[PDB]
Design a protein around this ligand. Sequence first.
Ligand SMILES: [Mn+2]
Ligand SMILES: [Mn+2]
Ligand SMILES: [Mn+2]
Ligand SMILES: [Mn+2]
Ligand SMILES: [Mn+2]
Ligand SMILES: [Mn+2]
Lengths: 274, 275
Amino acid sequence: PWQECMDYAVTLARQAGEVVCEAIKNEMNVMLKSSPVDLVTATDQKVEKMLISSIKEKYPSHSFIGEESVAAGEKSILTDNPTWIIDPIDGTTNFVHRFPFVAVSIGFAVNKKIEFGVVYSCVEGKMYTARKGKGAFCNGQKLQVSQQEDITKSLLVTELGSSRTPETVRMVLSNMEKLFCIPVHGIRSVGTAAVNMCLVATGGADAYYEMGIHCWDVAGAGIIVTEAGGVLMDVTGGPFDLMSRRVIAANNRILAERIAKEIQVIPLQRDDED
Amino acid sequence: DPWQECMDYAVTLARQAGEVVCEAIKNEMNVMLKSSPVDLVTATDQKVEKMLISSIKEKYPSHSFIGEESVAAGEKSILTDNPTWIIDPIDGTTNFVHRFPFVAVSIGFAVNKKIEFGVVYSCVEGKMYTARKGKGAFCNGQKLQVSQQEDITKSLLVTELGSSRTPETVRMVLSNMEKLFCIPVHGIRSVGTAAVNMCLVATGGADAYYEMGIHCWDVAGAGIIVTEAGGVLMDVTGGPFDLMSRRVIAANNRILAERIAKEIQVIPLQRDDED
Ligand SMILES: [Mn+2]
Ligand SMILES: [Mn+2]
Ligand SMILES: [Mn+2]
Ligand SMILES: [Mn+2]
Ligand SMILES: [Mn+2]
Ligand SMILES: [Mn+2]
């Protein structure tokens, strides 16, 4: 199948993780992108170029969407062509702080649909993988989402986002308040969308939601959630859309829809538009 | 030290408790309620505490105890000058119930109302955090050191949302988070346990922790781990840390700690030494 590509992606993710693990122990030269909290290092850029060059060598006809390449001006247009969607370091803020949740994420799409995903949580050495119809795994353990259908007994994960616009922050915190006071059992944040979603795939959390993420944040981990038996959808309640900047990844449609009901949507530029 | 024997024993008990927790987290559970539908307890919380207290009692029968589930059973949380074991059998019960992979056993040891050593065992991770006053802080044998960051706008904070769901209180918690977030700081994280949050500050992986609503047993173990890693403990008023006050800032340094105190509005709470 696409098994050969996927096996290759796993090896590449592991080599990239090694690079990240070595770098996290050394001095940080922190650079800014769009804001004082939108960070990047040479390691983000070096890993992405290593991944893309390696994939290009083995699969010259394939396409790429990568976070830092987009920063370099490349487009985030998803065609039917086999496409590697890469976040070279998901959790750069974690990375520069040595907060031990840092992931390399690779999603592989054919006909605009994800066929496999790989998320390597580098510091804890957890390799999360899933291939469509083949199940989801972490380090040899098959994953299953939780069974919880009662929102008042749920544990959620989310992130506060990269915006510091007071209006936007107020909405993010207001959405959190509404969910919190349903009540739910709690809300957690480990600082990486990919790893948050993998935690839902393991059943250790019941659902994740976030507005403001990008296709590369969720392309790897989405299929890991669904192959664990979970569901993806938009915070609008509509179908999940890789390019829409919005995601609920949950154990089931009952929690997912209950969460969507509470979330006030924020306007966001799609990844596939100017 | 004469307390060194106590500490060695504490490390032994913590690992033992940790093994019990790690086994139970894979199994089905009876989840019970304490003060509210979101304030949870399991048979494991209670069993681990009973085991820890009885073990310590047999070996040091003149010592005092402050334990979370014992207080729930009616025992007094008053700290005297007597050697006192301050115990959270499972810090992270909601995590435990969900198999969210951050769960800690915490033991703090006070003499003359001052913590002499702390032990925090992060069960799922297999990370034993320890510190004896004057002797430094360690994680699995490796010496810990807090971060150097003095610029709040380049800091990473940890905190928790708390057990209250009272709208007014939640609004204050979130308002405090908003003020810090918009300074700005680089980010805020929550792994679901005060003890582990503080141990992350000890390692330098986070720059500071703050919370109002914790109890002495949440922070008794990890507090000295932070300070022996080079950090500071402080009240949210910027004043001296008060173990029984329900409030804490645990930071890499006083510059960040005072900056955080500046933004925080205090939430009214019953002290651990009040009825
Ligand atoms: Mn980035
Ligand atoms: Mn990234
Ligand atoms: Mn990312
Ligand atoms: Mn409790
Ligand atoms: Mn507890
Ligand atoms: Mn606790």
